[PDB]
Design an enzyme around this catalytic site. Structure first.
Site, PDB file in Angstrom:
ATOM      1  N   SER A 239       0.804  -1.219   0.000  1.00 18.34           N
ATOM      2  CA  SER A 239       0.000   0.000   0.000  1.00 18.34           C
ATOM      3  C   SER A 239       0.834   1.264   0.000  1.00 18.34           C
ATOM      4  O   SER A 239       0.297   2.337  -0.299  1.00 18.34           O
ATOM      5  CB  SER A 239      -0.923   0.024   1.216  1.00 18.34           C
TER       6      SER A 239
ATOM      7  N   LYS B 123       0.725   3.731  -2.912  1.00 18.73           N
ATOM      8  CA  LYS B 123      -0.276   4.781  -3.048  1.00 18.73           C
ATOM      9  C   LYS B 123       0.310   6.180  -2.898  1.00 18.73           C
ATOM     10  O   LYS B 123      -0.350   7.155  -3.270  1.00 18.73           O
ATOM     11  CB  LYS B 123      -1.378   4.558  -2.017  1.00 18.73           C
TER      12      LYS B 123
ATOM     13  N   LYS C 226       2.178   7.218   5.443  1.00 18.71           N
ATOM     14  CA  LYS C 226       1.423   6.129   4.821  1.00 18.71           C
ATOM     15  C   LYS C 226       1.711   4.794   5.497  1.00 18.71           C
ATOM     16  O   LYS C 226       2.877   4.459   5.728  1.00 18.71           O
ATOM     17  CB  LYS C 226       1.747   6.012   3.328  1.00 18.71           C
TER      18      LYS C 226
ATOM     19  N   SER D 252      -6.534   3.892   3.051  1.00 15.69           N
ATOM     20  CA  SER D 252      -5.847   3.016   2.103  1.00 15.69           C
ATOM     21  C   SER D 252      -6.843   2.202   1.274  1.00 15.69           C
ATOM     22  O   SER D 252      -6.718   0.986   1.132  1.00 15.69           O
ATOM     23  CB  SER D 252      -4.850   2.099   2.822  1.00 15.69           C
TER      24      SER D 252
HETATM   25  C1  LIG Z   1      -1.895  -1.721   1.665  1.00 14.46           C
HETATM   26  O1  LIG Z   1      -0.935  -2.317   2.038  1.00 14.46           O
HETATM   27  C2  LIG Z   1      -3.248  -2.348   1.785  1.00 14.46           C
HETATM   28  N1  LIG Z   1      -3.044  -3.738   1.992  1.00 14.46           N
HETATM   29  C3  LIG Z   1      -3.861  -4.721   1.309  1.00 14.46           C
HETATM   30  O2  LIG Z   1      -4.737  -4.393   0.585  1.00 14.46           O
HETATM   31  C4  LIG Z   1      -3.599  -6.201   1.533  1.00 14.46           C
HETATM   32  N2  LIG Z   1      -2.981  -6.827   0.638  1.00 14.46           N
HETATM   33  O3  LIG Z   1      -2.675  -8.193   0.719  1.00 14.46           O
HETATM   34  C5  LIG Z   1      -2.535  -8.733  -0.564  1.00 14.46           C
HETATM   35  C6  LIG Z   1      -4.114  -6.823   2.824  1.00 14.46           C
HETATM   36  C7  LIG Z   1      -4.076  -8.209   3.220  1.00 14.46           C
HETATM   37  S1  LIG Z   1      -4.723  -8.320   4.589  1.00 14.46           S
HETATM   38  C8  LIG Z   1      -5.164  -6.895   5.001  1.00 14.46           C
HETATM   39  N3  LIG Z   1      -5.822  -6.533   6.239  1.00 14.46           N
HETATM   40  N4  LIG Z   1      -4.807  -6.001   3.956  1.00 14.46           N
HETATM   41  C9  LIG Z   1      -4.038  -1.596   3.004  1.00 14.46           C
HETATM   42  N5  LIG Z   1      -3.153  -1.612   4.177  1.00 14.46           N
HETATM   43  C10 LIG Z   1      -3.778  -1.635   5.613  1.00 14.46           C
HETATM   44  C11 LIG Z   1      -2.828  -1.547   6.790  1.00 14.46           C
HETATM   45  O4  LIG Z   1      -1.861  -0.744   6.733  1.00 14.46           O
HETATM   46  O5  LIG Z   1      -3.012  -2.281   7.798  1.00 14.46           O
HETATM   47  C12 LIG Z   1      -5.411  -1.221   5.841  1.00 14.46           C
HETATM   48  C13 LIG Z   1      -5.935  -1.173   7.053  1.00 14.46           C
HETATM   49  C14 LIG Z   1      -6.288  -1.502   4.570  1.00 14.46           C
HETATM   50  S2  LIG Z   1      -5.491  -2.270   3.301  1.00 14.46           S
END
Ligand SMILES: *C(=O)[C@@H](NC(=O)/C(=N/OC)c1csc(N)n1)[C@@H]1N=C(C(=O)O)C(=C)CS1
Length: 247
Positions: A35, A38, A199, A95
């Site tokens: 993420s 982004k 981020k 995110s």
């Molecule tokens: C960025 O890293 C986002 N991560 C994801 O969409 C995930 N990708 O796995 C392929 C994922 C798996 S499990 C999970 N809870 N997200 C966003 N990053 C987070 C964070 O920093 O914890 C958010 C709370 C939403 S998704």
């Protein structure tokens, strides 16, 4: 360099005034960043507004993600149409993966990853950085990867070129014009003096990641944490890194 006992596998903190390392650990190691991608999308959105190519008030329908269980703005709201402005806030605060992909598609369609990697080169990131998508989701099994050094160079370029990014990343909650509350994933906001970014990210492979930025007395520092053990530990490492940053 002091000895920290970080959860993170790779970590660093740098002074923006000279770019010089104040703490580094595996700072050249190629790591999944998910993420955190982004921030590149945000940068390219901001570039497009300055260049008269994108309006903050354009309304866009959210693109549909292949995975439902993905964290998405549409899943939470059941509303498909959003302004560019709100999609950008949704991308930066919660995110929202579909928010990021909708902005990427509007900017360059299928060529958006190439634009991300073009911009990576312009901003001086090494060849070990590879972006694959506007949200950071895998594409064709390929993962977005970078180093804490390249992430520093990207983050400081973003903040120096578009300082108004921090007007959004410093808010624990963004309320849109029509009253939608978008909750930040940055639990350190309000806990560390000067902290106004930047981020979060998480995947199974990437662990818990966070790029932090804070400013005090005209001194800005940027901290990078990749692959911490829990959502809390990435902020504990960041607290540790910020103390080294402002020593
Ligand atoms: C960025 O890293 C986002 N991560 C994801 O969409 C995930 N990708 O796995 C392929 C994922 C798996 S499990 C999970 N809870 N997200 C966003 N990053 C987070 C964070 O920093 O914890 C958010 C709370 C939403 S998704």
């Amino acid at each position: 360099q002091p000895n920290l006992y970080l959860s993170a596998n790779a970590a660093a903190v740098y002074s923006v005034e000279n770019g010089e390392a104040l703490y580094e650990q595996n700072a050249d190691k190629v790591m999944p960043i998910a993420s955190l991608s982004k921030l590149m999308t945000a940068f390219l959105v901001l570039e497009a507004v300055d260049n008269n190519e994108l309006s903050w008030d354009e309304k866009l329908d959210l693109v549909r993600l292949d995975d439902p269980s993905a964290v998405s703005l549409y899943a939470i709201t059941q509303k498909r149409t959003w302004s560019v402005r709100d999609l950008y806030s949704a991308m930066l605060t919660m995110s929202a993966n579909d928010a990021a992909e909708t902005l990427g598609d509007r900017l360059d369609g299928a060529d958006f990853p190439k634009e991300m990697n073009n911009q990576a080169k312009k901003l001086g990131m090494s060849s070990k950085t590879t972006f694959v998508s506007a949200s950071g989701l895998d594409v064709d099994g390929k993962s977005a990867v970078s180093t804490t050094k390249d992430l520093f160079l990207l983050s400081s370029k973003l903040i120096s070129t578009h300082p108004e990014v921090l007007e959004t990343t410093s808010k624990p909650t963004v309320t849109t014009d029509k009253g939608a509350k978008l909750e930040s994933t940055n639990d350190l906001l309000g806990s560390i003096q000067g902290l106004d970014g930047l981020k979060t990210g998480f995947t199974d492979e990437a662990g818990y990641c966070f790029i932090g930025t804070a400013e005090r007395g005209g001194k800005r520092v940027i901290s990078i944490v990749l692959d911490a053990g829990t959502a809390e530990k990435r902020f504990k490492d960041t607290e540790k890194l910020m103390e080294v940053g402002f020593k």
